[PDB]
């Protein structure tokens, strides 16, 4: 829970999380990394020196890609979401995407926030 976090090195992240960083953020420098706990659920957080932040679940699968200082790399985003954003907000870039096992939440440069379920039905749209 609150304040139970521990600092970690990159080589202590699950393999999948290390590969994700090398694939999508190869030139970023890690500023800090930690492991968090919530009951028996572990999560990992990485912040780069430019301020961009990643969170991963216990298996190193991303739950947050917060690129508010740049943009979310397009290869990270599910096609259905890319397509929806491209049609409906053609000039916006994505600053942040988060997900759990039930939904995705997307935040765009133009202030719009969109929630999709796992089948990509738009649940809520807010500004
Ligand atoms: C609090 As920050 C450096 O992840 O915007």
Residue numbers in the entry: 0, 20 to 145
Q: What's written in the study?
A:
Proteins that contain the DUF2874 domain constitute a new Pfam family PF11396. Members of this family have predominantly been identified in microbes found in the human gut and oral cavity. Sequence analysis and structural comparisons reveal that BVU2987 and other DUF2874 proteins are related to β-lactamase inhibitor protein, PepSY and SmpA_OmlA proteins and hence are likely to function as inhibitory proteins. Analysis of our structure and of the available sequences shows that collectively this family forms part of a larger superfamily of bacterial periplasmic proteins that all adopt a fold similar to β-lactamase inhibitor protein (BLIP-like fold) and appear to share some broad spectrum of inhibitory function.
BVU2987 is a 145-residue protein with a calculated pI of 5.36 and is annotated as a putative periplasmic protein based on the predicted N-­terminal signal peptide. The structure of BVU2987 was determined by MAD phasing to 1.85 Å resolution. The crystallized protein contained residues 20–145 of the full-length protein and an N-terminal glycine (that remained after the cleavage of the expression and purification tag). The final model contained one monomer, one cacodylate anion (from the crystallization condition) and 133 water molecules in the asymmetric unit. Crystal-packing analysis using PISA, in addition to analytical size-exclusion chromatography coupled with static light scattering, indicated that the monomer was the favored oligomeric form in solution. The monomer is formed by a tandem repeat of a structural motif, possibly arising from a gene-duplication event, comprised of four antiparallel β-strands and a short helix–loop–long helix. Thus, residues 28–85 and 92–145 can be superimposed with an r.m.s.d. of 1.7 Å and a sequence identity of 22% over 54 aligned Cα atoms. Although these aromatic residues are not conserved in BVU2987, other aromatic residues (Trp57, Phe58, Tyr122, Trp130 and Phe138) are present in the corresponding shorter loops in BVU2987, which may be functionally important. For BVU2987, the negatively charged concave surface is most likely to reflect binding to a positively charged partner. The BVU2987 structure is the first structural representative of a novel protein family, which has now been added to the Pfam database as DUF2874.
